[PDB]
Amino acid sequence: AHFAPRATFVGHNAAIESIEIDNEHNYLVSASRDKSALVWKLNRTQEQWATPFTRLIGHNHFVSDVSLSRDASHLLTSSWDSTLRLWDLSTRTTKKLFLGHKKDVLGVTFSPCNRRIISVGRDNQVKIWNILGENKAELQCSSWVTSVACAPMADETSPLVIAVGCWDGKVYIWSIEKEAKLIKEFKAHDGRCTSVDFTPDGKWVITGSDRKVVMWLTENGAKTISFTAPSPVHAVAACPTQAWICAATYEGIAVWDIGAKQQIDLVQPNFNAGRTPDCTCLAWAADGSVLYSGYNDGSIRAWEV
Protein backbone atom coordinates (compact mmCIF):
# COMPACT_ATOMS: atom_id res chain seq x y z
CA ALA A 1 0.00 0.00 0.00
CA HIS A 2 0.94 3.68 -0.43
CA PHE A 3 2.86 5.70 2.18
CA ALA A 4 2.81 9.34 3.34
CA PRO A 5 5.62 11.94 3.67
CA ARG A 6 7.22 11.31 7.09
CA ALA A 7 10.16 13.75 7.09
CA THR A 8 12.43 15.70 4.78
CA PHE A 9 15.79 16.54 6.35
CA VAL A 10 18.80 18.38 4.88
CA GLY A 11 22.42 19.02 5.87
CA HIS A 12 24.13 18.67 2.53
CA ASN A 13 24.58 21.48 0.04
CA ALA A 14 25.51 19.86 -3.28
CA ALA A 15 23.78 16.72 -4.66
CA ILE A 16 23.78 13.18 -3.22
CA GLU A 17 25.24 10.34 -5.32
CA SER A 18 24.60 7.33 -3.04
CA ILE A 19 23.13 6.41 0.37
CA GLU A 20 23.29 3.43 2.77
CA ILE A 21 22.04 2.48 6.25
CA ASP A 22 23.86 0.65 9.08
CA ASN A 23 22.42 -2.51 10.62
CA GLU A 24 19.14 -2.62 12.54
CA HIS A 25 18.48 1.16 12.73
CA ASN A 26 20.00 4.52 13.58
CA TYR A 27 23.03 5.68 11.55
CA LEU A 28 22.59 6.21 7.82
CA VAL A 29 25.29 7.70 5.65
CA SER A 30 24.73 9.80 2.60
CA ALA A 31 27.75 9.89 0.34
CA SER A 32 27.79 13.36 -1.17
CA ARG A 33 28.98 15.09 -4.34
CA ASP A 34 30.23 17.82 -2.02
CA LYS A 35 33.07 15.36 -1.31
CA SER A 36 32.03 15.22 2.31
CA ALA A 37 30.11 12.20 3.53
CA LEU A 38 28.02 12.58 6.67
CA VAL A 39 26.65 10.03 9.08
CA TRP A 40 23.31 10.82 10.77
CA LYS A 41 21.46 9.39 13.75
CA LEU A 42 17.73 8.72 13.84
CA ASN A 43 15.53 10.03 16.67
CA ARG A 44 12.19 9.58 14.84
CA THR A 45 10.62 12.24 17.11
CA GLN A 46 7.89 14.38 15.49
CA GLU A 47 9.61 17.29 13.73
CA GLN A 48 13.24 16.25 13.19
CA TRP A 49 13.78 12.66 12.02
CA ALA A 50 17.59 12.81 12.27
CA THR A 51 20.55 15.08 13.07
CA PRO A 52 24.10 14.83 11.64
CA PHE A 53 26.79 13.02 13.67
CA THR A 54 30.12 13.22 11.76
CA ARG A 55 31.68 14.56 8.56
CA LEU A 56 34.36 12.65 6.62
CA ILE A 57 36.65 15.25 5.01
CA GLY A 58 39.51 13.59 3.15
CA HIS A 59 38.79 13.06 -0.55
CA ASN A 60 39.58 15.69 -3.22
CA HIS A 61 36.47 15.07 -5.36
CA PHE A 62 32.83 13.85 -5.11
CA VAL A 63 32.22 10.76 -2.95
CA SER A 64 30.75 8.04 -5.21
CA ASP A 65 29.71 5.06 -3.08
CA VAL A 66 29.65 4.19 0.62
CA SER A 67 29.69 0.77 2.31
CA LEU A 68 29.43 -0.38 5.89
CA SER A 69 30.63 -2.99 8.37
CA ARG A 70 28.16 -5.45 9.93
CA ASP A 71 29.14 -3.84 13.29
CA ALA A 72 28.58 -0.25 12.09
CA SER A 73 32.18 0.51 13.18
CA HIS A 74 34.58 0.77 10.26
CA LEU A 75 32.83 2.09 7.13
CA LEU A 76 34.52 2.54 3.74
CA THR A 77 33.93 5.12 0.98
CA SER A 78 35.19 6.00 -2.50
CA SER A 79 35.54 8.97 -4.84
CA TRP A 80 36.51 10.07 -8.35
CA ASP A 81 39.80 10.92 -6.62
CA SER A 82 40.92 7.41 -7.64
CA THR A 83 41.40 6.30 -4.05
CA LEU A 84 39.28 4.76 -1.27
CA ARG A 85 39.22 5.57 2.48
CA LEU A 86 38.53 3.39 5.53
CA TRP A 87 37.23 5.69 8.27
CA ASP A 88 36.94 4.75 11.93
CA LEU A 89 33.29 5.34 12.73
CA SER A 90 33.73 6.79 16.23
CA THR A 91 36.73 9.08 15.74
CA ARG A 92 36.66 9.73 11.99
CA THR A 93 40.37 9.87 11.01
CA THR A 94 41.24 7.78 7.97
CA LYS A 95 42.55 4.36 8.99
CA LYS A 96 44.18 3.52 5.65
CA LEU A 97 43.78 4.72 2.05
CA PHE A 98 43.90 2.46 -1.05
CA LEU A 99 46.25 2.91 -3.99
CA GLY A 100 46.34 1.06 -7.31
CA HIS A 101 43.06 2.13 -8.95
CA LYS A 102 43.75 4.54 -11.82
CA LYS A 103 40.52 6.33 -12.82
CA ASP A 104 37.51 7.65 -10.85
CA VAL A 105 36.06 4.91 -8.60
CA LEU A 106 32.30 4.43 -8.90
CA GLY A 107 31.29 1.42 -6.73
CA VAL A 108 32.12 -0.21 -3.37
CA THR A 109 30.76 -3.13 -1.33
CA PHE A 110 31.85 -5.41 1.51
CA SER A 111 31.04 -9.10 1.72
CA PRO A 112 28.39 -10.24 4.25
CA CYS A 113 31.10 -11.35 6.73
CA ASN A 114 33.62 -8.44 6.39
CA ARG A 115 36.02 -10.35 4.13
CA ARG A 116 36.58 -8.78 0.70
CA ILE A 117 36.43 -5.08 -0.27
CA ILE A 118 35.09 -4.77 -3.85
CA SER A 119 36.11 -1.42 -5.37
CA VAL A 120 35.31 -0.67 -9.03
CA GLY A 121 35.57 2.14 -11.61
CA ARG A 122 36.60 3.37 -15.04
CA ASP A 123 39.88 1.44 -15.49
CA ASN A 124 37.65 -1.53 -16.57
CA GLN A 125 38.43 -3.83 -13.64
CA VAL A 126 36.71 -4.98 -10.44
CA LYS A 127 39.57 -4.99 -7.93
CA ILE A 128 39.23 -7.27 -4.89
CA TRP A 129 41.21 -5.97 -1.88
CA ASN A 130 41.88 -7.49 1.53
CA ILE A 131 40.46 -5.80 4.66
CA LEU A 132 44.14 -5.28 5.54
CA GLY A 133 44.53 -3.21 2.34
CA GLU A 134 46.34 -5.04 -0.46
CA ASN A 135 45.17 -6.22 -3.87
CA LYS A 136 44.20 -9.91 -4.18
CA ALA A 137 42.34 -10.27 -7.51
CA GLU A 138 41.92 -8.16 -10.67
CA LEU A 139 38.85 -9.22 -12.67
CA GLN A 140 38.27 -7.79 -16.15
CA CYS A 141 35.53 -6.43 -18.45
CA SER A 142 34.85 -4.55 -21.72
CA SER A 143 33.67 -1.07 -20.68
CA TRP A 144 33.31 1.17 -17.58
CA VAL A 145 31.50 -0.12 -14.49
CA THR A 146 28.84 1.99 -12.73
CA SER A 147 27.65 -0.26 -9.90
CA VAL A 148 28.05 -3.49 -7.90
CA ALA A 149 26.24 -5.51 -5.22
CA CYS A 150 26.83 -8.61 -3.09
CA ALA A 151 24.66 -11.65 -2.37
CA PRO A 152 23.39 -11.77 1.21
CA MET A 153 24.63 -14.29 3.78
CA ALA A 154 26.26 -17.42 2.27
CA ASP A 155 27.63 -18.63 5.62
CA GLU A 156 31.28 -18.08 4.62
CA THR A 157 31.59 -21.35 2.68
CA SER A 158 29.13 -20.41 -0.06
CA PRO A 159 30.50 -18.42 -2.98
CA LEU A 160 29.75 -14.74 -2.43
CA VAL A 161 28.08 -13.60 -5.64
CA ILE A 162 29.09 -10.29 -7.30
CA ALA A 163 26.66 -8.76 -9.82
CA VAL A 164 28.07 -5.94 -12.01
CA GLY A 165 26.45 -3.38 -14.38
CA CYS A 166 28.43 -1.76 -17.19
CA TRP A 167 28.43 1.44 -19.27
CA ASP A 168 28.24 -0.33 -22.67
CA GLY A 169 25.24 -2.59 -21.86
CA LYS A 170 26.62 -5.86 -20.47
CA VAL A 171 25.90 -7.44 -17.06
CA TYR A 172 28.57 -9.73 -15.54
CA ILE A 173 27.95 -12.10 -12.61
CA TRP A 174 30.85 -13.76 -10.75
CA SER A 175 31.58 -16.33 -8.05
CA ILE A 176 34.52 -16.03 -5.64
CA GLU A 177 35.63 -19.03 -3.53
CA LYS A 178 39.30 -18.28 -4.46
CA GLU A 179 39.97 -17.86 -8.22
CA ALA A 180 36.62 -16.05 -8.87
CA LYS A 181 35.10 -17.58 -12.01
CA LEU A 182 32.14 -15.78 -13.58
CA ILE A 183 28.95 -17.82 -13.50
CA LYS A 184 27.54 -16.05 -16.56
CA GLU A 185 27.98 -13.01 -18.82
CA PHE A 186 25.15 -11.37 -20.77
CA LYS A 187 23.98 -8.37 -22.80
CA ALA A 188 21.55 -7.48 -20.02
CA HIS A 189 20.68 -3.95 -21.18
CA ASP A 190 20.14 -2.41 -24.61
CA GLY A 191 22.34 0.65 -24.11
CA ARG A 192 23.60 1.81 -20.72
CA CYS A 193 23.28 -0.28 -17.56
CA THR A 194 22.91 2.10 -14.64
CA SER A 195 22.39 0.28 -11.36
CA VAL A 196 22.49 -3.26 -9.91
CA ASP A 197 20.97 -4.85 -6.79
CA PHE A 198 20.08 -8.37 -5.59
CA THR A 199 16.84 -9.94 -4.46
CA PRO A 200 17.23 -10.76 -0.70
CA ASP A 201 16.93 -14.54 -1.34
CA GLY A 202 19.41 -14.28 -4.25
CA LYS A 203 17.83 -16.60 -6.81
CA TRP A 204 17.26 -13.45 -8.91
CA VAL A 205 19.18 -10.24 -9.74
CA ILE A 206 18.15 -6.70 -10.82
CA THR A 207 19.58 -4.33 -13.47
CA GLY A 208 18.34 -1.43 -15.64
CA SER A 209 19.02 3.42 -19.56
CA ASP A 210 16.34 2.19 -22.00
CA ARG A 211 13.41 2.69 -19.51
CA LYS A 212 13.23 -1.03 -18.65
CA VAL A 213 13.74 -2.69 -15.25
CA VAL A 214 14.71 -6.31 -16.00
CA MET A 215 15.06 -9.13 -13.45
CA TRP A 216 17.45 -11.97 -14.38
CA LEU A 217 18.50 -15.35 -12.91
CA THR A 218 21.52 -15.69 -10.58
CA GLU A 219 22.22 -19.21 -11.87
CA ASN A 220 22.79 -19.42 -14.80
CA GLY A 221 21.11 -16.47 -16.53
CA ALA A 222 18.37 -15.23 -18.90
CA LYS A 223 15.32 -13.21 -17.91
CA THR A 224 12.39 -14.05 -15.64
CA ILE A 225 10.48 -10.84 -16.38
CA SER A 226 10.81 -7.43 -18.06
CA PHE A 227 8.93 -4.35 -16.82
CA THR A 228 8.81 -0.91 -18.51
CA ALA A 229 9.48 2.23 -16.44
CA PRO A 230 7.92 5.57 -17.57
CA SER A 231 11.20 7.57 -17.69
CA PRO A 232 14.81 6.41 -17.39
CA VAL A 233 15.83 5.22 -13.93
CA HIS A 234 19.07 5.84 -12.03
CA ALA A 235 18.93 3.47 -9.01
CA VAL A 236 17.12 0.17 -8.30
CA ALA A 237 16.69 -1.61 -4.93
CA ALA A 238 14.38 -4.45 -3.79
CA CYS A 239 12.69 -4.53 -0.35
CA PRO A 240 14.20 -6.88 2.31
CA THR A 241 11.06 -8.40 3.86
CA GLN A 242 8.00 -8.08 1.58
CA ALA A 243 7.82 -8.85 -2.15
CA TRP A 244 8.43 -5.36 -3.62
CA ILE A 245 10.82 -3.81 -6.13
CA CYS A 246 11.41 -0.08 -6.63
CA ALA A 247 13.02 2.24 -9.10
CA ALA A 248 13.97 5.95 -9.01
CA THR A 249 12.61 7.64 -12.16
CA TYR A 250 12.41 11.38 -12.82
CA GLU A 251 8.60 11.30 -12.50
CA GLY A 252 8.55 9.36 -9.21
CA ILE A 253 9.50 6.05 -7.58
CA ALA A 254 7.71 3.22 -9.42
CA VAL A 255 6.56 0.67 -6.81
CA TRP A 256 6.17 -2.78 -8.40
CA ASP A 257 4.43 -5.55 -6.52
CA ILE A 258 6.27 -8.50 -8.11
CA GLY A 259 3.58 -11.22 -7.84
CA ALA A 260 0.69 -8.96 -8.87
CA LYS A 261 3.06 -7.83 -11.65
CA GLN A 262 2.26 -4.09 -11.89
CA GLN A 263 3.05 -0.59 -10.56
CA ILE A 264 0.76 -0.16 -7.52
CA ASP A 265 2.06 3.38 -6.73
CA LEU A 266 4.28 6.25 -7.91
CA VAL A 267 5.46 8.64 -5.16
CA GLN A 268 6.91 12.08 -5.88
CA PRO A 269 6.36 14.98 -3.42
CA ASN A 270 5.13 18.35 -4.72
CA PHE A 271 7.45 21.21 -5.71
CA ASN A 272 8.86 26.76 -16.33
CA ALA A 273 11.83 25.44 -18.37
CA GLY A 274 13.50 23.79 -15.32
CA ARG A 275 14.45 20.17 -14.65
CA THR A 276 13.39 20.08 -10.97
CA PRO A 277 14.95 17.46 -8.57
CA ASP A 278 15.69 13.91 -9.69
CA CYS A 279 16.15 11.06 -7.20
CA THR A 280 19.58 9.49 -7.80
CA CYS A 281 19.57 6.73 -5.12
CA LEU A 282 17.37 4.58 -2.86
CA ALA A 283 17.92 2.88 0.49
CA TRP A 284 15.57 0.46 2.23
CA ALA A 285 16.24 0.08 5.96
CA ALA A 286 17.12 -3.45 7.15
CA ASP A 287 13.64 -4.03 8.69
CA GLY A 288 11.66 -3.06 5.56
CA SER A 289 9.92 -0.35 7.61
CA VAL A 290 11.07 2.79 5.82
CA LEU A 291 12.21 4.00 2.37
CA TYR A 292 14.88 6.71 2.13
CA SER A 293 15.69 8.40 -1.21
CA GLY A 294 18.51 10.88 -1.93
CA TYR A 295 17.83 13.83 -4.23
CA ASN A 296 19.60 16.05 -6.75
CA ASP A 297 19.27 19.47 -5.07
CA GLY A 298 20.75 17.99 -1.84
CA SER A 299 18.01 16.54 0.37
CA ILE A 300 16.80 13.16 1.69
CA ARG A 301 13.14 12.15 2.18
CA ALA A 302 11.71 9.31 4.33
CA TRP A 303 8.48 7.38 3.64
CA GLU A 304 7.02 4.60 5.85
CA VAL A 305 4.40 1.98 4.97
Added chain:
Amino acid sequence: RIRTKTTKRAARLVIERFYGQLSFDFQDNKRVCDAVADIPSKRMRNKIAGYVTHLMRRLERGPVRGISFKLQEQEREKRDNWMPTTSKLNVPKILVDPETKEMLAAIGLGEMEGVEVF
Protein backbone atom coordinates in the same frame (compact mmCIF):
# COMPACT_ATOMS: atom_id res chain seq x y z
CA ARG B 1 31.29 34.02 -22.68
CA ILE B 2 30.25 32.66 -26.10
CA ARG B 3 31.21 29.20 -27.31
CA THR B 4 33.44 29.33 -30.40
CA LYS B 5 33.04 27.54 -33.75
CA THR B 6 35.52 24.77 -32.82
CA THR B 7 33.83 23.73 -29.53
CA LYS B 8 30.32 23.83 -31.07
CA ARG B 9 31.39 21.83 -34.14
CA ALA B 10 33.03 19.26 -31.86
CA ALA B 11 30.04 19.07 -29.50
CA ARG B 12 27.60 18.44 -32.37
CA LEU B 13 29.97 15.76 -33.76
CA VAL B 14 30.05 14.08 -30.31
CA ILE B 15 26.23 13.82 -30.14
CA GLU B 16 26.23 12.51 -33.74
CA ARG B 17 28.21 9.43 -32.73
CA PHE B 18 27.69 8.91 -28.98
CA TYR B 19 24.12 9.66 -27.93
CA GLY B 20 24.15 6.10 -26.53
CA GLN B 21 26.35 7.53 -23.78
CA LEU B 22 25.73 10.94 -22.08
CA SER B 23 23.03 12.35 -19.78
CA PHE B 24 21.54 15.65 -18.52
CA ASP B 25 24.29 15.89 -15.84
CA PHE B 26 27.52 17.81 -16.60
CA GLN B 27 29.95 15.91 -14.35
CA ASP B 28 29.23 12.64 -16.18
CA ASN B 29 29.57 14.09 -19.70
CA LYS B 30 32.84 15.87 -18.87
CA ARG B 31 34.39 12.46 -18.13
CA VAL B 32 32.90 11.00 -21.36
CA CYS B 33 34.48 13.60 -23.67
CA ASP B 34 37.98 12.64 -22.47
CA ALA B 35 37.47 9.04 -23.66
CA VAL B 36 35.40 9.85 -26.77
CA ALA B 37 37.76 12.55 -28.12
CA ASP B 38 41.49 13.17 -27.54
CA ILE B 39 41.65 16.81 -26.34
CA PRO B 40 44.86 18.71 -25.44
CA SER B 41 43.73 20.78 -22.44
CA LYS B 42 41.38 20.58 -19.44
CA ARG B 43 39.53 23.86 -20.13
CA MET B 44 38.52 22.67 -23.63
CA ARG B 45 36.60 19.61 -22.38
CA ASN B 46 34.72 21.64 -19.74
CA LYS B 47 33.44 23.96 -22.50
CA ILE B 48 32.72 21.05 -24.90
CA ALA B 49 30.82 19.14 -22.19
CA GLY B 50 29.11 22.44 -21.26
CA TYR B 51 27.50 22.60 -24.72
CA VAL B 52 26.88 18.83 -24.84
CA THR B 53 24.74 19.29 -21.70
CA HIS B 54 23.06 22.37 -23.24
CA LEU B 55 21.98 20.39 -26.33
CA MET B 56 20.62 17.49 -24.22
CA ARG B 57 17.97 19.68 -22.52
CA ARG B 58 17.17 21.16 -25.92
CA LEU B 59 16.79 17.58 -27.24
CA GLU B 60 14.26 16.84 -24.43
CA ARG B 61 11.90 18.68 -26.80
CA GLY B 62 11.45 19.05 -30.59
CA PRO B 63 14.30 18.00 -32.89
CA VAL B 64 17.26 20.40 -33.08
CA ARG B 65 18.34 21.79 -36.47
CA GLY B 66 21.69 20.67 -37.95
CA ILE B 67 22.22 17.53 -35.84
CA SER B 68 21.40 13.82 -36.27
CA PHE B 69 22.04 11.17 -33.61
CA LYS B 70 21.09 7.76 -35.13
CA LEU B 71 18.21 6.88 -32.74
CA GLN B 72 16.00 9.54 -34.38
CA GLU B 73 17.19 8.41 -37.85
CA GLN B 74 15.76 4.95 -37.03
CA GLU B 75 12.62 6.51 -35.48
CA ARG B 76 12.00 8.83 -38.49
CA GLU B 77 12.07 5.82 -40.87
CA LYS B 78 9.21 4.06 -39.01
CA ARG B 79 7.32 7.37 -38.63
CA ASP B 80 7.96 7.94 -42.36
CA ASN B 81 7.08 4.59 -43.87
CA TRP B 82 3.54 3.67 -42.77
CA MET B 83 0.46 5.07 -44.51
CA PRO B 84 -3.11 4.91 -43.11
CA THR B 85 -5.79 2.51 -44.30
CA THR B 86 -8.09 3.91 -47.00
CA SER B 87 -7.39 6.49 -49.69
CA LYS B 88 -9.02 9.33 -47.76
CA LEU B 89 -9.77 10.85 -51.16
CA ASN B 90 -13.34 9.58 -51.45
CA VAL B 91 -16.19 11.68 -50.01
CA PRO B 92 -17.36 9.87 -51.87
CA LYS B 93 -20.03 12.26 -53.19
CA ILE B 94 -17.50 15.05 -53.77
CA LEU B 95 -18.96 18.56 -53.63
CA VAL B 96 -18.19 20.78 -56.64
CA ASP B 97 -18.76 24.49 -57.47
CA PRO B 98 -21.25 25.61 -60.21
CA GLU B 99 -18.62 26.82 -62.73
CA THR B 100 -16.37 23.79 -62.09
CA LYS B 101 -19.32 21.53 -63.02
CA GLU B 102 -19.58 23.40 -66.37
CA MET B 103 -15.87 22.62 -66.86
CA LEU B 104 -16.66 18.91 -66.31
CA ALA B 105 -19.29 19.29 -69.04
CA ALA B 106 -16.74 20.79 -71.46
CA ILE B 107 -14.18 17.97 -70.96
CA GLY B 108 -16.94 15.47 -71.90
CA LEU B 109 -17.40 13.75 -68.53
CA GLY B 110 -20.67 14.99 -66.99
CA GLU B 111 -22.88 12.42 -65.30
CA MET B 112 -19.73 11.36 -63.39
CA GLU B 113 -21.58 10.39 -60.18
CA GLY B 114 -20.06 13.25 -58.17
CA VAL B 115 -22.43 15.83 -56.77
CA GLU B 116 -22.99 19.50 -57.62
CA VAL B 117 -23.19 23.09 -56.34
CA PHE B 118 -24.37 22.92 -52.69
Added chain:
RNA sequence: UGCAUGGCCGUUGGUGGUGCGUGGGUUGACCUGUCCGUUGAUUCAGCUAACGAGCGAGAUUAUCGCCAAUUAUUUACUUUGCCGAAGUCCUUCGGUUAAAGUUCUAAUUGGGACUCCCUGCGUAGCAGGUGGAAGAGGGUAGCAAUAACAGGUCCGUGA
Protein backbone atom coordinates in the same frame (compact mmCIF):
# COMPACT_ATOMS: atom_id res chain seq x y z
C1' U C 1 73.83 60.44 -46.18
C1' G C 2 68.07 56.60 -41.73
C1' C C 3 65.61 60.52 -48.54
C1' A C 4 70.60 54.31 -50.86
C1' U C 5 69.80 49.89 -47.40
C1' G C 6 69.66 45.21 -43.59
C1' G C 7 67.90 44.00 -38.94
C1' C C 8 65.42 45.78 -34.48
C1' C C 9 61.74 49.00 -32.36
C1' G C 10 57.52 52.62 -31.96
C1' U C 11 53.09 53.92 -34.38
C1' U C 12 48.43 53.91 -37.59
C1' G C 13 45.46 50.10 -34.26
C1' G C 14 46.08 45.19 -30.00
C1' U C 15 41.29 47.96 -32.60
C1' G C 16 38.67 43.25 -35.01
C1' G C 17 40.43 42.74 -38.84
C1' U C 18 42.66 40.57 -43.44
C1' G C 19 42.64 38.33 -47.97
C1' C C 20 43.15 32.81 -51.40
C1' G C 21 40.73 27.93 -54.58
C1' U C 22 36.52 26.89 -57.83
C1' G C 23 31.66 29.27 -59.14
C1' G C 24 28.55 33.59 -60.33
C1' G C 25 27.86 39.31 -61.52
C1' U C 26 30.40 43.43 -64.63
C1' U C 27 32.90 45.83 -71.24
C1' G C 28 35.98 47.35 -66.86
C1' A C 29 38.25 49.51 -62.17
C1' C C 30 35.89 45.80 -59.13
C1' C C 31 32.16 43.21 -56.41
C1' U C 32 29.97 38.79 -54.25
C1' G C 33 31.87 35.03 -50.55
C1' U C 34 33.49 38.96 -46.25
C1' C C 35 25.43 39.92 -45.31
C1' C C 36 18.31 40.72 -38.77
C1' G C 37 19.65 39.63 -32.91
C1' U C 38 23.94 38.38 -29.70
C1' U C 39 29.44 39.01 -27.99
C1' G C 40 35.33 42.27 -25.75
C1' A C 41 35.69 40.12 -30.90
C1' U C 42 34.12 38.66 -39.32
C1' U C 43 32.06 36.10 -31.38
C1' C C 44 28.22 32.89 -32.53
C1' A C 45 23.13 32.46 -34.40
C1' G C 46 20.59 32.41 -38.87
C1' C C 47 19.58 34.68 -43.88
C1' U C 48 21.73 33.58 -48.69
C1' A C 49 24.76 33.32 -56.03
C1' A C 50 27.59 31.41 -53.56
C1' C C 51 30.18 26.68 -51.48
C1' G C 52 34.88 25.33 -49.34
C1' A C 53 39.90 26.01 -47.08
C1' G C 54 42.80 29.42 -44.29
C1' C C 55 45.51 33.66 -40.98
C1' G C 56 44.10 37.17 -36.69
C1' A C 57 40.27 36.60 -32.38
C1' G C 58 39.74 32.07 -29.30
C1' A C 59 42.68 27.98 -27.94
C1' U C 60 47.71 27.59 -25.93
C1' U C 61 52.13 29.59 -22.55
C1' A C 62 53.40 32.15 -17.67
C1' U C 63 52.00 33.53 -12.88
C1' C C 64 48.52 34.85 -8.52
C1' G C 65 44.35 32.58 -5.59
C1' C C 66 41.92 27.00 -3.26
C1' C C 67 42.61 21.98 -2.84
C1' A C 68 45.76 16.30 -1.34
C1' A C 69 48.54 13.00 -3.11
C1' U C 70 54.26 12.57 -3.77
C1' U C 71 58.98 13.60 -0.52
C1' A C 72 61.97 16.33 3.86
C1' U C 73 65.09 14.79 12.22
C1' U C 74 71.67 18.36 9.49
C1' U C 75 69.09 24.00 3.73
C1' A C 76 61.63 24.59 6.09
C1' C C 77 58.91 24.12 10.39
C1' U C 78 55.46 21.61 14.15
C1' U C 79 54.05 18.23 18.12
C1' U C 80 55.71 15.15 21.99
C1' G C 81 60.10 13.65 24.93
C1' C C 82 64.74 14.93 27.14
C1' C C 83 68.66 18.96 29.56
C1' G C 84 69.01 24.04 30.76
C1' A C 85 67.55 29.37 32.91
C1' A C 86 63.64 32.13 35.36
C1' G C 87 58.41 31.31 37.25
C1' U C 88 59.27 29.19 41.37
C1' C C 89 52.42 23.40 41.18
C1' C C 90 53.08 23.66 35.79
C1' U C 91 53.25 29.34 32.62
C1' U C 92 57.07 31.32 29.01
C1' C C 93 61.69 31.13 26.77
C1' G C 94 66.59 28.68 24.49
C1' G C 95 68.89 24.04 22.84
C1' U C 96 68.84 18.98 20.89
C1' U C 97 71.50 13.45 13.95
C1' A C 98 65.48 11.99 19.15
C1' A C 99 60.82 9.64 18.23
C1' A C 100 56.64 10.72 15.10
C1' G C 101 55.10 13.68 11.22
C1' U C 102 53.33 17.87 7.32
C1' U C 103 48.95 22.90 9.57
C1' C C 104 52.51 26.76 8.31
C1' U C 105 57.71 26.44 4.41
C1' A C 106 59.70 24.71 -0.33
C1' A C 107 57.77 22.56 -5.80
C1' U C 108 56.59 18.66 -9.15
C1' U C 109 52.29 15.52 -11.08
C1' G C 110 46.96 16.05 -11.10
C1' G C 111 41.89 17.89 -9.36
C1' G C 112 38.88 22.55 -9.73
C1' A C 113 34.19 26.59 -12.97
C1' C C 114 31.03 24.70 -17.50
C1' U C 115 26.43 30.01 -17.96
C1' C C 116 26.32 23.16 -15.35
C1' C C 117 22.26 24.56 -11.65
C1' C C 118 17.41 27.59 -10.53
C1' U C 119 14.24 32.17 -11.84
C1' G C 120 13.19 36.01 -15.12
C1' C C 121 14.06 38.18 -20.33
C1' G C 122 15.13 37.17 -25.77
C1' U C 123 17.41 29.69 -30.57
C1' A C 124 22.66 32.56 -30.17
C1' G C 125 22.86 34.48 -25.48
C1' C C 126 21.59 38.10 -21.49
C1' A C 127 20.29 39.78 -16.06
C1' G C 128 19.87 38.18 -11.04
C1' G C 129 20.51 34.11 -7.32
C1' U C 130 22.06 29.65 -4.53
C1' G C 131 26.24 27.11 -3.51
C1' G C 132 31.47 27.81 -4.02
C1' A C 133 38.53 29.04 -2.75
C1' A C 134 36.98 31.46 -7.06
C1' G C 135 31.28 33.31 -11.38
C1' A C 136 30.75 35.29 -15.98
C1' G C 137 37.40 35.90 -20.78
C1' G C 138 38.44 33.52 -12.32
C1' G C 139 42.46 38.41 -11.80
C1' U C 140 47.06 40.14 -14.22
C1' A C 141 50.38 39.72 -17.95
C1' G C 142 52.86 37.38 -22.21
C1' C C 143 52.31 36.07 -27.66
C1' A C 144 49.54 38.85 -31.68
C1' A C 145 47.27 38.84 -38.90
C1' U C 146 47.63 41.37 -43.51
C1' A C 147 48.72 46.45 -45.35
C1' A C 148 51.82 50.81 -44.70
C1' C C 149 54.49 55.35 -42.41
C1' A C 150 60.57 58.50 -47.04
C1' G C 151 58.35 58.55 -38.15
C1' G C 152 63.35 56.42 -35.34
C1' U C 153 68.61 54.11 -35.35
C1' C C 154 74.97 54.47 -40.63
C1' C C 155 76.59 57.55 -32.01
C1' G C 156 75.16 49.17 -30.75
C1' U C 157 77.57 45.71 -34.00
C1' G C 158 83.09 41.86 -37.95
C1' A C 159 75.07 44.70 -40.67
